[PDB]
Amino acid sequence: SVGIVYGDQYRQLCCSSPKFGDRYALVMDLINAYKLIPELSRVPPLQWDSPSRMYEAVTAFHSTEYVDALKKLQMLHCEEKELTADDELLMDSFSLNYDCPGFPSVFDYSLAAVQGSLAAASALICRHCEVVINWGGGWHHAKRSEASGFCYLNDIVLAIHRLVSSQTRVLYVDLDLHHGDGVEEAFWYSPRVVTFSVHHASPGFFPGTGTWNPIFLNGAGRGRFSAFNLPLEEGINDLDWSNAIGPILDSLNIVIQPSYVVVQCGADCLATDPHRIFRLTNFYPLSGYLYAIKKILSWKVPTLILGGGGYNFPDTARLWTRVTALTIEEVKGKKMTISPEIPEHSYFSRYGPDFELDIDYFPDSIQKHHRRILEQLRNYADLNKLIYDYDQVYQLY
């Protein structure tokens, strides 16, 4: 089956943040508006039987002082009084400030994503689902003891930790516009979780990594060569983005032979995102996103699909609704007939001006990256005693 994380309390918590507003409700109500929910198995967010078990779950990656500070931040932001100077100091020491402010539900909001993505991974492990989608998860910038980029708790790291502990290998694929630095760093020393991020990188552009450092770093210790990165230039369209990462994806799968794939599918690469770095689409005749997901799904490896960035809420909905239909098609083998106009539903009015499912958009260095990345993959194969034909992979490029 294809699983999808939602629930009534889950939806309220995913829509309680000041930055992402009601995005999750547009997304699930468009998936519902297109009659896709009956095709999907609902996966309920994981809950715990005590504070200690929750704490144990989250501090599998995050420090206990950080988790404590995040909960105290929520408590402070639920009272009238302003933070003391000592409380502002303590929040500063975890970067619980600026781009990661406090708000009345900040802890419950952050934990909800972890609940969602841990349950998603358990559904994969117990083989209840072949694919699970969590459009409320994917917060890849959060670090062990530091929020970043509106990511307070790294649900991806925790879901991946659960998967590899269930020899188990996980391939993480980060399609967000921005470098997936939190997940890469969590597994920097681990060869069993191979991380791969395609992203924009340029001087000054958040978060600064996943590019020349001048060498490309790629893991350390036993995780040497296990962190993959493909920084691309602004303006890239669907076909060039697809061709840039198509052969890398296929060769990673050939060589790593992963037990699970986790795909972060941040929607801020859309041409219509207020970022406007890349020019990808949701078009389905082809959308770089849809091309990448179809390819990963053709592998028939149990796969977690997650959300992430995406600041044009209706176009994120348009995209993720198409990705969700595509998953149903490739997994179940059932054709999905999506109408070209948005169906009438609660959020219909948000889909101005023409109320179509297509977004309103009219559409040397990568070969060096391919040679670099393919050499890293051989170094990874050699370091980890993996068996593969170096000519069947080089054929892909």
Ligand SMILES: O=C(/C=C/c1ccccc1OCc1c(Cl)cccc1Cl)NO
């Ligand atoms: O997407 C992110 C992270 C996004 C992000 C991080 C740091 C600074 C700005 C950022 O986003 C720009 C933005 C915001 Cl903060 C609000 C509205 C519109 C735009 Cl463009 N994770 O990978």
Ligand SMILES: [K+]
């Ligand atoms: K990325």
Ligand SMILES: [K+]
């Ligand atoms: K790694």
Ligand SMILES: [Zn+2]
């Ligand atoms: Zn992003």
